[PDB]
Amino acid sequence: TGELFFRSGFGIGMRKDSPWKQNVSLSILKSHENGFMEDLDKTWVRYQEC
């Protein structure tokens, strides 16, 4: 219950200024844009409703 009070999404953290930031962020964004994120979500969460 309750209205959402802090609407900030999750994140895959990494050390500051690491060379991977651009690539990790871009790949996460592409997979999220693609069907991969939704597929990984449905089979793992929100799959049960009692």
């Binding site: 009070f5 802090f6 609407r7 900030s8 999404g9 964004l29 999220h32 844009e33 693609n34 069907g35 994120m37 939704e38």
Partner: protein, 186 residues
């Protein structure tokens, strides 16, 4: 004895069904792009059109996801969002495919019984807006902080409550009784 219990049970059933239907009203629609209907428009009664205004992120996503759907949805509204909403309200348009935030605000502001589909929670490819700045610009580090510092407070929440609102919360039948009587008489 038997008849007193019978009339008490009838009274209890009447009250129970009254309270059952009184606190019971909900509206739902198709599941969205995951459905084969959206995947396969060619059916017995093909959808009239899909309102994907081009030159946007929605067009790129739908083209790079379902090329057949993107080709079929060429009967899209060119001028603006408002024209498509008016056309859908009249009835030429079947369903509208567009940015989640703008469509949600339009639903929450526009009057009538028009509602967004149940895919509000199940929004497809949820990415979010942003403030784009020049490549590798030094302004990345401050803004990344500052806007974020806005979010971890009541600033952005209250501002959103101020600007984008309107009510008409995006939440009745009688033929079910006829269906029941037909089933019982059958």
């Amino acid at each position: 004895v038997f008849a007193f219990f019978a009339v008490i049970f009838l009274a209890s059933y009447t009250a129970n069904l009254a309270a059952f239907m009184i606190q019971e009203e909900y509206v739902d629609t198709v599941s969205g792009l995951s459905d084969r209907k959206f995947q396969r428009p060619q059916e017995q009664y093909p959808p009239l059109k899909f309102g994907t205004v081009p030159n946007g992120s929605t067009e790129k996503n739908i083209r790079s996801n379902y090329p057949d759907m993107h080709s079929y949805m060429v009967r899209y509204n060119q001028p603006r969002v408002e024209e498509a909403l008016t056309q859908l309200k009249a009835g030429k348009l079947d369903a509208f495919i567009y940015d989640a935030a703008v469509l949600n605000y339009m639903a929450r502001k526009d009057e009538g019984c028009k509602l967004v589909t149940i895919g509000s929670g199940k929004v497809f490819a949820t990415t979010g807006y942003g403030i784009a700045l020049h490549k590798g610009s030094r302004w990345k580090r401050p803004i990344d902080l500052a806007l974020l510092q806005f979010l971890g407070d009541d600033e952005i929440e209250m501002l959103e409550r101020l600007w984008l609102s309107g009510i008409c919360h995006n939440d009745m039948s009688s033929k079910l009784d006829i269906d029941n009587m037909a089933g019982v008489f059958y």
